[PDB]
């Protein structure tokens, strides 16, 4: 059972990774620059941050450009 | 864009020179005229096929000048909005 389980993930490992890849970077696109313990301070800065016509033409535009390739 | 009221008395000379050299636009690859009616509805969608993926397409790669009627009728009308959507 183990080695048709690896054998079904190994035909297609690429794929796999490249979605495991997506999500990482999606993950640390939005985290805080400071590392724990000393993320306190950017939830600290986020925390007092929070308590203290052209776009539709070139949306056409690019429509225009994608429906033609 | 430019425009000109001129009679059909004049000779093809004047007008060319004027539209390469006065007007500032380059000599065409290649030249394909457009004739045709049904007058004010748009053609069917076929024809449109025609014209946008067909002659407008095909154009866009050498470089050319399609000459059709300058008006809102339905050839000249679908005519120019193939060339926008390449263009």
Not at chain 1, 11 to 22: C, E, I
């Amino acid at each position: 059972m183990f080695s048709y389980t690896f054998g079904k993930v190994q035909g297609n490992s690429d794929l796999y990774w490249k979605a495991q890849r997506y999500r990482l970077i999606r993950e640390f696109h939005s985290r805080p620059a400071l590392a724990p313990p000393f993320i306190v301070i950017s939830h600290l800065r986020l925390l007092l941050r929070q308590l203290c016509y052209l776009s539709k033409e070139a949306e056409r535009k690019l429509l225009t450009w994608e429906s033609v390739h | 864009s430019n425009f000109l009221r001129l009679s059909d008395r004049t000779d093809p000379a004047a007008v060319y020179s004027l539209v390469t050299r006065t007007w500032g636009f380059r000599a065409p690859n290649l030249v394909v005229s457009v004739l045709g009616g049904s007058g004010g509805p748009v053609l069917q969608t076929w024809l449109q096929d025609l014209l946008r993926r067909g002659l407008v397409r095909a154009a866009q790669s050498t470089g050319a000048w399609i000459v059709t009627g300058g008006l809102h009728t339905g050839i000249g009308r679908h005519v120019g909005v193939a060339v926008r959507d390449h263009q």
